[PDB]
C-alpha cells in the first residue's frame, strides 16, 4: 500500500 | 554553489491559510529530476516530512496533511511555494525548504541513482508560531 | 505506514569516543537512507547519502552502513561540534520519513 518513491527501482 | 531561503509571516492565526514561499540560486527546477521539498519541526520536537515537488512537476504530500497542502512552483523565479490552509497551534513549528538531487547523468544519460537518497542543502528555516 | 525506529533515542560520550546510531525500518528501503546532523539553531546538516556513501565536505570520521531495515551510523572520533542531534531519514517510499531522532550529549 506504500508508494514507491520517484527513483525506486 | 547551492543556497535556498523560506519566507513568510512569522505569525497566523488559527483557520487561516499560510503560504510560505522558498526562494534558490544554483541550481533550477528545469534541471532534470531534481527536488524541492518542504520538511518542519515543532519547538524540540522531531522533523517532520511534508511534500516535494520535481523539476518536471511531479508532486507529492504527507498523506496526514495532503487534505491541506498545495506545493506548486515557479521555475522562472526559482521558487516553491507551499500553501497550507486551516492552520491550528499544533502547525507552529520551523519549516524548512530543501534540494534534492536528480540522478547523476553521462552525456545526458542517467548512471546513477544513489545521490537522489538523501535531501543535501537545507534552507535555514522560517519560525511560524499559530496563535489567535 | 513505514515506522523508521533510532536507537538509541539518547547517547552521552566524551570527545575522542566512537559512538554508533542506529536506525530500523519497519519494511525494507534498501539503501535509500540518509543520515543528518543538528545543532541546536541550525539546519540539519546531510551526513550520508544513499546509506553508506560520504556527502562532500563531510569529515571521514562518520560513516554509514546497513541496507534493507537496519542501518548504523558510526562516528570514529567523536568532536566538540559532533554534540548534536542525529536523524535518520527514509527516501524509498512515500512519505520520505524521518527518524525520531537521537541527542548526543556531554557526559558526566
Known amino acids: 500500500l506504500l508508494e514507491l518513491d520517484k527513483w525506486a527501482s | 554553489r547551492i543556497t535556498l531561503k523560506e519566507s513568510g509571516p512569522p505569525l497566523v492565526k488559527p483557520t487561516q491559510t499560510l503560504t510560505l514561499t522558498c526562494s534558490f540560486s544554483?541550481?533550477?527546477?528545469?534541471?532534470?529530476?531534481?527536488?524541492v521539498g518542504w520538511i518542519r519541526q515543532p519547538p524540540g520536537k522531531a522533523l517532520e516530512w511534508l511534500a516535494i515537488?520535481?523539476?518536471?512537476?511531479?508532486?507529492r504530500y504527507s498523506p496526514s496533511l495532503n487534505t491541506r497542502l498545495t506545493i506548486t512552483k515557479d521555475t522562472s523565479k526559482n521558487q516553491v511555494v507551499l500553501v497550507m490552509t486551516r492552520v491550528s497551534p499544533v502547525d507552529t513549528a520551523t519549516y524548512f525548504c530543501?534540494?534534492?538531487?536528480?540522478?547523476?547523468?553521462?552525456?545526458?544519460?542517467?548512471?546513477?541513482?544513489?545521490?537522489?537518497?538523501?535531501?543535501?542543502?537545507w534552507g535555514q528555516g522560517i519560525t511560524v508560531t499559530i496563535s489567535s | 505506514a513505514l515506522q523508521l525506529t533510532q536507537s538509541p533515542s539518547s547517547l552521552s560520550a566524551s570527545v575522542g569516543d566512537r559512538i554508533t546510531i542506529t536506525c530500523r525500518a519497519s519494511?525494507?528501503?534498501?539503501?535509500?537512507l540518509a543520515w543528518y546532523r543538528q545543532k541546536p539553531g541550525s539546519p540539519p546538516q546531510l551526513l550520508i547519502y544513499?546509506?553508506?556513501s560520504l556527502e562532500s565536505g563531510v569529515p571521514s570520521r562518520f560513516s554509514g552502513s546497513g541496507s534493507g531495515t537496519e542501518f548504523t551510523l558510526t562516528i570514529s572520533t567523536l568532536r566538540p561540534e559532533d554534540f548534536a542531534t542525529y536523524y535518520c531519514?527514509?527516501?524509498?517510499?512515500?512519505?520520505?520519513?524521518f527518524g525520531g531522532g537521537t541527542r548526543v550529549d556531554v557526559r558526566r
Open positions: 544513499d546509506a553508506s
Open positions: 530543501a534540494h534534492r538531487r536528480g540522478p547523476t547523468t553521462l552525456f545526458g544519460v542517467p548512471i546513477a541513482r544513489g545521490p537522489v537518497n538523501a535531501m543535501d542543502v
Open positions: 531519514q527514509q527516501l524509498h517510499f512515500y512519505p520520505h520519513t
Open positions: 519494511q525494507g528501503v534498501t539503501s535509500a
Open positions: 544554483g541550481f533550477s527546477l528545469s534541471d532534470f529530476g531534481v527536488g
Open positions: 515537488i520535481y523539476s518536471d512537476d511531479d508532486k
